[PDB]
Amino acid sequence: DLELEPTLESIVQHDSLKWIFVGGKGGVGKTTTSSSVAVQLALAQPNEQFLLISTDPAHNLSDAFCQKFGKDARKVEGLPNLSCMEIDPYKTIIFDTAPTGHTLRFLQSEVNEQFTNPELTTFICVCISEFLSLYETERMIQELMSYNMDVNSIVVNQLLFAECKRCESRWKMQKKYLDQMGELYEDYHLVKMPLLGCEIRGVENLKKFSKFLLKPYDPKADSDIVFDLE
Ligand SMILES: Nc1ncnc2c1ncn2[C@@H]1O[C@H](COP(=O)(O)OP(=O)(O)O)[C@@H](O)[C@H]1O
Ligand SMILES: [Mg+2]
Ligand code: NA
Ligand SMILES: [Zn+2]
Numbered sequence: 001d002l003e004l005e006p007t008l009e010s011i012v013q014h015d016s017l018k019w020i021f022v023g024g025k026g027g028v029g030k031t032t033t034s035s036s037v038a039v040q041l042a043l044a045q046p047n048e049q050f051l052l053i054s055t056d057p058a059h060n061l062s063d064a065f066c067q068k069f070g071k072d073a074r075k076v077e078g079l080p081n082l083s084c085m086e087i088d089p090y091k092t093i094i095f096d097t098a099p100t101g102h103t104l105r106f107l108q109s110e111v112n113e114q115f116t117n118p119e120l121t122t123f124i125c126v127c128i129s130e131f132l133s134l135y136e137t138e139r140m141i142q143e144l145m146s147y148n149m150d151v152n153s154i155v156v157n158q159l160l161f162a163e164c165k166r167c168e169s170r171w172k173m174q175k176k177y178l179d180q181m182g183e184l185y186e187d188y189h190l191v192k193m194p195l196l197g198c199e200i201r202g203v204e205n206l207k208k209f210s211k212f213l214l215k216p217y218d219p220k221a222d223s224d225i226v227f228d229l230e
Pocket of ligand 4: 164165166167
């Protein structure tokens with residue numbers, strides 16, 4: 001079977017991973033995706049300890065989790081096996097690389113043997129379906145491949161789906177690039193994630209978002225999620 005599952009299932013069930021990097025253009029949903037992945041990992045294996053670290057020069061994790069984080073790791077309230085860390089420079093470390101274009105200088109020696117080992121390290125690209133993000137995602141992947149960092153999954157986030165005149169017009173754009181991505185990323189897990197009815201904040205909402213990272217979102221059947229955030 002040549003059609004890869006459009007999910008992060010292969011990554012979250014990849015028991016040997018030590019590093020899960022998350023990268024992409026500013027605003028595409030790296031805080032959201034990296035936090036949701038970390039929440040899923042923590043929930044699935046409650047006896048193992050997970051760290052979510054962000055290099056974003058922002059209180060991104062703090063605002064997403066509604067809890068104060070910093071340079072020292074601190075456990076997430078309600079998920080005692082997940083810690084978060086915000087540092088402007090564990091079974092698995094999930095690593096939001098914001099700003100990705102700069103952090104890709106930092107990821108540059110026994111750590112390197114870890115990074116270039118596909119059994120220990122993967123890099124999830126996040127993008128939105130518009131020209132700049134797509135083309136910068138292509139560029140980022142080419143660069144990661146040249147440094148032998150594994151990439152097998154790409155999240156396309158903030159999608160509107162079939163069917164509001166503005167939304168119809170915007171979906172016309174989105175699907176044009178989505179169709180292009182389908183072809184570009186045939187050898188990849190290409191996860192289609194919908195735009196929700198509000199920002200994604202708090203552990204409960206992050207958990208809900210993470211559901212469709214692991215099971216393919218069907219806009220005809222699953223659209224309650226858009227309005228299901230509290
Ligand atoms: N699928 C989505 N639906 C609704 N809001 C989203 C979605 N993805 C991200 N967001 C929101 O969009 C904003 C940017 O997302 P964020 O994950 O912080 O991007 P990044 O970390 O890539 O800069 C945040 O305020 C976040 O709550
Ligand atoms: Mg930024
Ligand atoms: Na390669
Ligand atoms: Zn609309």
